[PDB]
């Protein structure tokens, strides 16, 4: 008989014991409670209040701040008349060119 081994187990249909089984556990009452708490701290607690939390996070990358200073620059540099965007950022006066 080759080896004294157990036969292949039979797949258990959770609906066979309790038709209202919910695939979280064999025992019905905690099976029910696992659902209520997985859905709660998951579909609702993090997927809704978490979603609005990240959605309502304060200004990311200072995007609003970047816009507000932007027009102040253009309004300044359009009023005087000099070009609104210099080619080089670091001032060549402050730099020391070798040779």
């Amino acid at each position: 008989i080759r080896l004294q081994e157990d036969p292949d187990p039979e797949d258990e249909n959770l609906y066979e014991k309790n038709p209202d089984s919910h695939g979280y556990d064999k025992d019905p009452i905690v099976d029910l409670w696992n659902m209520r708490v997985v859905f709660f701290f998951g579909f609702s607690i993090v997927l809704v209040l978490g979603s609005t939390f990240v959605a309502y996070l304060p200004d990311y990358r200072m995007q609003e701040w970047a816009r507000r200073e932007a027009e102040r620059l253009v309004k300044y540099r359009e009023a005087n008349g000099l070009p609104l965007m210099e080619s080089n950022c670091f001032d060549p006066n402050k730099i020391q060119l070798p040779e």
Partner: protein, 459 residues
């Protein structure tokens, strides 16, 4: 970051101290709670990383990745109590312990400020994953897979070790900050090339890169479902995360010493997607799909372009969420039929109406349908690569054509068609399987509205 690590560590006694059947509930609810605290870090300041201490720091690169890992932790837990329930209390308790030790290392890895501290935990993820694959893996070949997995990534990581310690003695500090500010031009000396190879090869192996990619079809095919996703959903991204971080000292040697990898990747994606056009095994089909999408990120990273980097991280997380999901799809059908072959179980839309949907927009997300962030990731890489070279589109564009043919092919063969006559053990799908699918789909499409939280520091 101690607001995340400490509760994760304290959750380890939590599971072991729990009762007989309450382990799944308490572990799930608190892990989900840990996920919520992780979302507190999504706000990245203007141009500075959210440096907390010398030990731990976070920026817009690890901010989405961290919450992906914490969010993942319930999903393996929600995907494990099916086959694990037929086991002793200790072994189930042990299984939960490993994944929590897994995420703890992952949380520490992404938040590490020092490349050595990055390095230690970066290899340390092998230890829990190896035992998970070997112990509870439901197959025979898994024993060969564990050796294949462990050595392959270590064979690249060990040369990495000598690279970092060399940097420490030569440049000075080794943390992520000083390296960036004190970065110096790397010469073209042949020693610098070998240091470039050492500093890079370890990360490419875990991506993987075409050729150095055979450990995915071994590991993923017969890994346990819970271990399959994490290895597919983040551990591949772990190799990705180091790619941005360590390519701050490898300039400008990146421009010349990248051509072999670009050619290996830009050709591998066509070849690996051509693998996917025909796979007898559903899980192997998904694993090779991960190779192609990851090969996109290798191209993305190696160009070292602003647009390329934001597309890289967007695709990196987006692929992880959908690749993990598709693995859950395989586990459900494999559970009913107790096999992995494609054609054995077919016409499953008629038998299971809702799973027909779940596998449907899973395929669409895998297809980079706009505006799903899979598209906003792939499309960015095309634009960056096209700027790098006009012929990149011929290959990388053809990927989206090949990616479509196989993606629907598994949808055609399994879900659509005629129901298998002899198969009669397929019961109605439990709400756990349906819920778990929603825990993946909803955050994906929800995050589509705000890609700025996934586009990384370069955004």
């Amino acid at each position: 970051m101690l607001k995340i690590i400490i509760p994760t560590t304290m959750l380890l006694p939590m599971t072991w101290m729990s009762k007989h059947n309450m382990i799944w509930i308490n572990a799930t609810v608190h892990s989900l709670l840990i996920s919520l605290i992780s979302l507190s870090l999504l706000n990245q300041l203007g141009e500075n990383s959210l440096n907390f201490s010398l030990t731990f720091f976070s920026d817009s690169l690890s901010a989405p990745l961290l919450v992906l890992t914490t969010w993942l932790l319930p999903l393996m837990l929600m995907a494990s109590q099916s086959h694990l329930s037929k086991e002793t209390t200790t072994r189930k308790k042990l299984y939960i312990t490993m994944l929590i030790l897994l995420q703890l290392f992952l949380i520490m890895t992404f938040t590490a400020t020092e490349l050595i501290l990055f390095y230690i935990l970066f290899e340390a993820t092998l230890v829990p994953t190896l035992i998970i694959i070997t112990r509870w893996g439901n197959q025979t070949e898994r024993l060969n897979a564990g050796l294949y997995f462990l050595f392959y990534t270590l064979a690249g990581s060990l040369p990495l070790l000598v690279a970092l310690v060399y940097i420490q003695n030569t440049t000075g500090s080794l943390n992520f900050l000083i390296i960036h500010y004190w970065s110096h031009p790397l010469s073209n000396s042949w020693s610098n090339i070998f240091m470039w190879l050492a500093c890079i090869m370890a990360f490419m192996v875990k991506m993987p890169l075409y050729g150095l990619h055979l450990w995915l079809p071994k590991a993923h095919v017969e890994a346990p479902i819970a271990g399959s996703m994490v290895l597919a959903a983040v551990l591949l991204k772990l190799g990705g995360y180091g790619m941005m971080r360590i390519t701050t000292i490898l300039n400008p040697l990146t421009n010349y010493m990248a051509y072999p990898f670009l050619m290996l990747s830009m050709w591998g994606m066509i070849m690996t997607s051509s693998i996917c056009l025909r796979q007898t095994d559903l899980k192997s089909l998904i694993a090779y799909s991960s190779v192609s999408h990851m090969a996109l990120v290798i191209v993305a990273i190696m160009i070292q372009t602003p647009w390329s980097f934001m597309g890289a991280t967007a695709l990196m997380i987006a692929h992880g969420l959908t690749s993990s999901m598709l693995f859950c799809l395989a586990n459900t059908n494999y559970e009913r039929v107790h096999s992995r072959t494609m054609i054995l179980a077919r016409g499953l839309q008629t038998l299971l109406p809702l799973m027909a949907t779940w596998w449907l927009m899973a395929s669409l997300t895998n297809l980079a349908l706009p505006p799903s962030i899979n598209l906003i990731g792939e499309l960015f890489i095309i634009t960056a690569s096209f700027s790098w070279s006009n012929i990149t589109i011929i290959l990388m564009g053809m990927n989206m054509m090949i990616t479509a043919l196989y993606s629907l092919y598994m949808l055609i063969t399994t879900q659509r068609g005629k129901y298998t006559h002899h198969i009669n053990n397929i019961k109605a799908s439990f709400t756990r399987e349906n819920a778990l699918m929603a825990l993946h789909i909803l955050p994906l499409l929800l995050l589509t509205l705000n890609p700025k939280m996934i586009l990384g520091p370069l955004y």
